[PDB]
Subunit: 494 residues, 4 copies
């Protein structure tokens, strides 16, 4: 039961958020934000750059000083504040979902049910960890009492993408704040608006000034000012593998800030002949087509065992033709646009390369309409490993179906990539489920399912799909810096 | 390479061990110890009773005093000492395996390979935990610094059975000493000898006097003096359910000592029609017949799905006929005797009740030989839930085979017992493996195997099969007592 | 800022709570509940006995069946429900606090601020753990995949006292429910009313029927029916050491249910000559006098170093005379009554024994008024270790002040008791704070403070003050039963 | 019992170690290795470069393949192998200590007692973790079974310095192998020899070929080939800040390899007026002067409260005059040389800058001897924060003494650096010990001691002193890569 979206949405929060106040850009420049389904301008936003990032970093640093309200507050109160923030998101759920759909080209009921649901659940999970992040007491050698503190890391710069704008925002700030950090967040230039609304809710919830700062603007300006900043203790980034390398490099060049990255993928989904086919087809399909193919974890290499290949192809093609393209706020639309022209063209070019290189176009395979960035859902069969569409992250509604016969071969092929974010396996065989999931070089492996992401699980990549984990117990701990304290005593006892 | 067993074994360690010295019993009484295969007396051992336990408890208490060598030693030195002990057991393996086989009625190659191997591995595992048992620092409300210590509990009384005498001995002392406790061990009256040899090695390894004390003797005398003792901080018991109840009652009446129990079982082994049959037959067979059926975890209700039941029965019966009974030191013998007359008679009485209640006797069914307590390997089929042989722990070489046709039924029947020590499930279906293992009320559930016990895993019962877990990470934490220390400070910071 | 208490409170929930419904006692009997400050009857409550407990246990067992709503619900939803319950407590805070003050003889603003605040904080802490209770994956020997499940224990019987009725109620149900158990709760006969109100809020929050059942009634009837019940998996108890022994015994005799206990104390508070005296006097004072001396953790042996003894006595006596006795709902009253006549007389008798045995009565020392169970706040000096008032838990407003000179002596004297719940030390010396807190045989040790209890910390006794811990990470885990699952695989890899 | 050092040492292991075999460099070049006390050449070693690193990386990759001996071995056997290696180091202790002292300029009794002792203890600690590294099972939302594996990361390049060559070698390989990784080690060009001896012992202990590979050689050649390598999964580096930046940059540019760094320091040691002076003088003195000042953690800003500053200076100066410089193998020598010319000259240049900037030269201040790189022990007083000797890591026997009078000031001054490796605080005040240790931005804070480093504790820097922790529980988790496995099931139960 999903309400009707708001239609005549008026914008309010369009400025830089520092110390719980709204500021104009130091330059005075602004940049436009668009609806990808219509190409209309939604509003303009202050364009943050280096000098705005520097103010935000100062604010975050002051809020993190020993003795400050955020440092001396009970851990349990950090938790309380995070739950209050989630209450405010629930109150503003329609507004946020509409806003997210409009700005992001995202199907409204998905934005309402999945994105917003995920935002709330994430924050609630995080809230619960605040007073449960613990250090140790250690029975070291000699007459000493030794303990550790799990302290916050400090000022954390957080740079995020356009595909799940609000959700990614909360994935970053929730764990950081739960652990006691302060943050400077740089939303994607395509999708600042829901993040800016969150600023108003952070203030309303009662967070002290300087605890969250938000600086909308471009990557090589505001983004790079964060990655290179001499007083940012940690940078966390989600985005393209290419900018990820630049972030790590900049961290090295500047102050050796801690780095965490999630960079997208080319995730294999392997379907063995004993799999439940109905289950497998639907999961594989959603796994590559969700949000117009704009998921990091997209099942973009679908390996199907020979004896079921033709049938799986047939069913996949049938499934891919059940969409109605158009405005994602409009009742009955089941596929939205891609986010912007750069992505649209990237994807068309890759689609052309699959045609040129001999893959079999089964459906779709070109643009749709004459307004907004729409691409027809496309399936290719007889794809081979050396094709661009088998190698490169497409980030559009383009499914690749490939054949295998040997178990050892499909594992080596699945693993033969610099990516490692996720993978899926479909089989009813216990032994294969365990051993194949052990052998895949992927951060998450799903078994008889795909795209199952929950706040209780750590999430992130092997190899060039990432450094570190987000969420679960394991993620939390990476927003802490360990301090060992060792005290000389006259006599130690067990 | 299993070497030849020693033959002409001379006994040396036959006394009460306290403060690293050997003592006569206070009464001067001794009790005889027998070889169950031949009924000949091996030697006499000092008969420990209440007054000897009191001496052992004072020794253990003194060794536990704040400022003693054992309390002030580095945790890592506790670990070194445990590893040194394991070296000594390695050195003395042939002698201990021989002794264990003679005293216990145990197949000599099994004593040498399984029991002794397990002793060594258990101690090595324990040794590694010693300086890794850690407390916490805790972000509690208010201007306080709080931490916890994982202290040893103190003086632990440890009462053990006759079926794996040396391995049980090490299962008790290893974790206890790892965590810094002192102990008073009470070996079974049937099988004190390898434990007494262990005293010599504990001394040789260099443990401080009073850290391990061993009081051979009977149950209602020495055992009960431990369970009722007003200065024992914890009792750990492995044995019968009946006596476990007495121990727990004694603890309640005396000084509320902490209690952990492992009490045996009536463990179900469920073989689904989709299972690998060769694998299931062998594991289920070893699962009930191992060590003349004298395993707490014996797979003594074998539920087999109707479509494969007859075949499974036929194959189990054929497998059960491949034994040579005799002296467990003699090459080619593959089944030894039961431990003693009382067990022998309990088993024959239960075999008799199966015949009387209408079970189908497939093979075996009575004694063998003219010396020592031997029973033919016995298989009953068409067993039903209401039969004594389906409800009571038999603890001899007696297999019950029953059938089932519904998943829900067989879970409910498996669970319908006051026991809950272990269970097995044989299937190739992923869903059944996870969901049935979740639904079984048993401490250890094996899938496509049985009797896989390892030091890294916690082991113990649901329901009346026990309280607490032994070994693994979890075991070690039940040999500690948690102390919270909360220190007022002028101002807390995260 | 505390509101005025309700004055004309009408009672509504007076029945047995089973399956989210209100039931008459099977017998039809009822028992009266009184205001201890006035001796007026508040109302009558259904008198639960064995047959009511049996219905409650059946309900709890059915709610815990595999497939039931409570077993299949997301862990995160158990958390959500617990936070909703805390929201309802906040909504009903005035009502509950008034009710608690009236029924319990508790100072209203303490009930409002401390008890109710604690109730809410406790539940919020618990809620946060629900989806963070995790098992393990274990790299055991051999070709196996091994994991553990932290499953709930089952049906947990929970028996509680009259001193902090609502708070103790939530201490029990919060962690149990967070971990997925079902419960049968037996409030104290003196103080059922706030617990019964909680039943209405549990239903209103949405908990499934049978998840919490509440059976008001007496100890040797309803209490003993729980401790002896053959289908209760665990009993948790707070109360007198005497009934604790009976609970453990009954657990042993019946079904070996798991036992956890918190049993009160004789806690030492040690004040060294370098202590801040202002701080120390006020903490020691509150530490023994809070809630009319009716805290388990009462600082009822106050050891003061010789050179400051006379001054500490003087200041303590002055502090003890600053009370206004009377009705705990009345503005300006700072000391309420004791809970009932049995306690009142226990305390008077102990006060008489201190007079008889030669302690120096410094103030108070007898009853007050002629209605309700009021005792004048009493301080004794020159108390010695062999006096009844130095040995026995008094549970009334009676402070014992004792002298020491030697550090080693005061430690041995502090430790010379069967009790071990808590202790305090006041010193500015780092070395003493660490080493003395290590040497004290007490579950919680406070340093330069006293009575600091928070949900993030495990809480419970050494020796005869308890078995197990409540709250913190450590408590949570004791409402779980560990299951190890070991799966045979073709080949294991690290 | 420190034995006499060997004199007439013959070298045997001088080559590149790959797959348990010794190789010439691919170029055929060798490089000379010197004794810094005498400047004489010890031997020549094969000069490893990019092509030799490529060979080592292929070997390590192959040894890491799914199904290899190293991947399929029981975790507990990894532990056994580590303990066996520690046995071999024990056997070869005199030879290794002699070698370490000759090659490193290190006091022979310190090499034998401290360095070698530490090597052995570090490996024993690591050995015990191997089969105790565990993942999780996770109660995630929905009908799923989720678990995590703590897998090894893979191929780890490990680049180490000249100051504790063998101990650093074991600090790197111990945890890495414990967790199941394979490695490529690059010892410092000044000090390859004990590491090459270790290759022989790795082979003798029985590790599979390719599990450890060692490539002696220079930094910008072999080191850089590791940090840039497209098939190394993680680089771990201990050394200068400057080079740490290069490594992190190289990782970003190449394959986003995981990076951990320990980079040295400018560690403050704060002595309050209430401290025990005798204790503080000695710890602060050893804290800066140990191993000719060549410790990352050197207490190189000594802040002393004004009321005791002059006395502290006087006593420090007297202590600094009790050295005999010479060959560190000669009985009675208590200070050896600096490692090499470049370090020697860096130190003299810094000493010079102290004189020029107005520090008060109390003793020492220039070179000594006519052979080897010796510098007089030097103490400067009246040092101020802006001086080169207060800002830069000197890494020679040079003590800076400064004064302070306010707690707030001294914390701010201690923290005002880009380093954050360690700090010490000397005080007897409980409040200061906890609160100042909390406020210091340093990885290890010692209280009333200094330089207490133990295998059970995590060790590493805040800020530009490092990324990540080594050793303790926490260290071991950075040699793992977390994989989440999520399996669809028909119905989940708690
Ligand atoms: N630890 C504590 O917080 C605590 C609380 C109350 C009392 N006490 C101590 O105990 C003394 C006596 O108080 P009490 O008589 O009110 O406490 P108690 O131990 O009798 O009662 C505690 C709870 O146990 C129940 N109970 C009583 N008898 C039982 C039995 N035979 N089987 C099962 N349950 C039973 C009661 O009905 C109540 O719910 C007090 O003076 C005090 O010293 C300690
Ligand atoms: C009874 C004991 C004391 N207490 C306090 O809050 C005293 C504080 C007084 C100074 C303002 C307290 C609190 C909680 O939460 C408890 C829980 C369980 C057992 C005992 C207590 C106490
Ligand atoms: Mg880009
Ligand atoms: Mg018996
Ligand atoms: Mg009573
Ligand atoms: Mg250099």
């Amino acid at each position: 039961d999903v309400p009707a979206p708001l239609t005549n949405l008026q914008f309010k929060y369009t400025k830089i958020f520092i110390n719980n106040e709204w500021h104009s850009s130091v330059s005075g420049k602004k940049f436009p934000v668009f609806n990808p389904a219509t190409e209309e301008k939604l509003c303009e936003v202050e364009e943050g750059d280096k000098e705005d990032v520097d103010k935000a970093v100062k604010a975050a640093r002051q809020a993190f000083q020993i003795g400050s309200p955020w440092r001396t507050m009970d851990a349990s109160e950090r938790g309380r504040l995070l739950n209050k923030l989630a209450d405010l998101i629930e109150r503003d759920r329609l507004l946020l979902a509409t806003m997210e759909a409009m700005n992001g080209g995202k199907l409204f009921s998905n934005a309402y049910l999945m994105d917003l649901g995920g935002c709330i659940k994430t924050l609630r999970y995080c809230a619960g960890w605040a007073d449960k992040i613990q250090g140790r007491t250690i029975p070291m050698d000699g007459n000493f009492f030794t303990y550790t503190r799990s302290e916050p890391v400090g000022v954390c710069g957080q740079i995020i993408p356009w595909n799940f704008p609000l959700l990614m925002f909360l994935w970053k700030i929730g764990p950081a704040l739960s652990c006691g950090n302060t943050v400077v967040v740089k939303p994607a230039e395509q999708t600042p608006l829901t993040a800016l609304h969150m600023g108003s809710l952070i203030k309303e919830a009662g967070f002290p000034p300087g605890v969250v700062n938000i600086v909308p603007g471009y990557g090589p300006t505001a983004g790079a000012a964060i990655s290179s900043h001499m007083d940012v203790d940690k940078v966390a980034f989600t985005g393209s593998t290419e900018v990820g390398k630049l972030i790590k490099e900049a961290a090295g060049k500047s102050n050796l800030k801690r780095v965490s990255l999630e960079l997208g993928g080319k995730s294999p989904c392997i379907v063995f002949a004993d799999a439940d086919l109905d289950n497998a087809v639907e999961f594989a399909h959603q796994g590559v087509f969700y949000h117009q193919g704009q998921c990091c974890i997209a099942a973009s290499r679908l390996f199907v065992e020979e004896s079921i290949y033709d049938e799986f192809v047939r069913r996949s093609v049938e499934r891919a033709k059940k969409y109605v393209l158009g405005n994602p706020l409009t009742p009955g639309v089941s596929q939205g646009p891609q986010i912007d022209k750069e992505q649209y063209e990237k994807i068309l070019d890759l689609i052309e390369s699959g045609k040129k290189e001999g893959a079999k176009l089964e459906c779709g395979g070109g643009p749709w309409g004459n307004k907004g960035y729409f691409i027809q859902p496309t399936v290719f069969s007889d794809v081979t490993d050396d094709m661009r569409i088998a190698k490169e992250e497409i980030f559009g509604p383009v499914q690749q179906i490939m054949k295998f016969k040997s178990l050892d071969d499909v594992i080596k092929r699945a693993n033969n990539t610099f990516y490692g974010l996720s993978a899926g396996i479909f089989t009813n065989d216990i032994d294969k489920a365990i051993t194949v999931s052990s052998a895949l070089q992927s951060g998450t492996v799903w078994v008889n399912c795909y795209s199952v992401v929950s706040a209780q699980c750590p999430f992130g990549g092997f190899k060039m799909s990432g450094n570190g984990r987000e969420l679960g117990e394991y993620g939390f701990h990476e927003y802490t810096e360990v301090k060992t304290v060792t005290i000389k005593i006259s006599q130690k006892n067990s």
